[PDB]
């Protein structure tokens, strides 16, 4: 439909919680070829984020219930694996809007590492249930992407910008959970913060911004507990 | 998990 | 199998993937057997979790629906996507309602079980009335009612007044009063009843179930504080 | 909706 018939459907779907709806209607807002406004890639974020985690939250689950199990062993494998079919076809869908049309068509430093650092994060995603010879690809995927993302965003964006500051949460989080080096974590998560309270007096994205602070300082406090 | 990402804020 | 099917379906609730969840059940119903009574939960919590997020989307949509008058563009988009909705939440309740009357309410060989399944007949068809168009509605409203009745006829005769079976039955037929029927005395009447007469018979109470019966009192008390304002 | 059927337990 009308690309702006499109966005208002996905709202509608947004407010229904019909994730599937809303992120239909956003990968056809991208697939008509043009640069998504802020709104409109807000809405694309949001409706697979939800898409997606509805899938890695279950498939924590049934992963546990494999571990602390032979019967039943077996049958959490398989229902594991149709869940990760699921994941993988639902990251690869966003992998490839970002590599066909998002990514080159980003125009500004802050689009461009909003969808970079969304490279990073379904990349993660799949790295989360990778195994085997695939994995060390995917893992190396990610950080390539978040890293690009983290250059940019040092270079253009303030340490207060709140993309900036998601970017390095995001970071952090890769470093901590794929890459199992927890001190890089603290570093990058404690040098976001350090510099984004060193500026809290030139803040425009208040609460946006201090809110992935907070994110920032929590997960300070658990990993160095 | 009690780590958190972005995605606990949208 | 059939255990294959049930160790999997509480493997989907587990997930919480109660599409999933309800598929097991289901293809464990058309098997034809009477249900264990772990079986019958697993499905009754199964398509309660699927036909509710239908019953919250419709709900969501039907108010913005009502909310964008003046609004033709918006109204007209919502209206569509509650019909859209609708669609999904029919089919689920005709395929609910589908495997009462083919297996489940022929099947019953007791009377808790014939009261459970009567009553989750006057649920889904009252699922159906929330959302029927004008000349199906009355048709669906008195299938719901006649459901609740039958149900309520064998819970007051075979149960004690502290079953949470006849406990929740009183209170989904009192909600079809206040919310289809549009009844709130009768609705009051019926809450109150069930609550004062499991009060009067507080002896007949398991270790087992009496937590879930004072849990439909409170609810049933609930609804009378609220539909007494 | 503050109304309550059985599916709140």
């Not at chain 1, 995927?141 to 040092?154: D, G, R």
């Not at chain 1, 390095?168 to 890089?184: D, G, H, M, R």
């Amino acid at each position: 439909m009308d690309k702006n018939e499109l966005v208002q459907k996905a709202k509608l779907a947004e407010q229904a919680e019909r994730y599937d709806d809303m992120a239909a209607c956003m990968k056809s807002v991208t697939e008509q070829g043009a640069e998504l406004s802020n709104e409109e890639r807000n809405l694309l974020s949001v409706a697979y984020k939800n898409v997606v985690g509805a899938r890695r939250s279950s498939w924590r689950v049934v992963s546990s219930i494999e571990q602390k199990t032979e019967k039943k062993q077996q049958m959490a494998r398989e229902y594991r694996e149709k869940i990760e079919t699921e994941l993988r076809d639902i990251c690869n869908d966003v992998l490839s809007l970002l590599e066909k049309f998002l990514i080159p068509n980003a125009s500004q430093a802050e689009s461009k590492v909003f969808y970079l650092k969304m490279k990073g994060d379904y990349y993660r995603y799949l790295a989360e249930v990778a195994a085997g010879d695939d994995k060390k690809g995917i893992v190396d995927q990610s950080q390539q992407a978040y890293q690009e993302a983290f250059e940019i965003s040092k270079k253009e964006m303030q340490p207060t910008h709140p993309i900036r500051l998601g970017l390095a949460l995001n970071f952090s989080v890769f470093y901590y959970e794929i890459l199992n080096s927890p001190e890089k974590a603290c570093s990058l998560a404690k040098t976001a913060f350090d510099e984004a309270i060193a500026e809290l007096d030139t803040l425009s994205s208040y609460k946006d911004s201090t809110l992935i602070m907070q994110l920032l300082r929590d997960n300070l406090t658990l990993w160095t507990s | 998990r009690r780590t958190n990402s972005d995605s606990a804020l949208h």
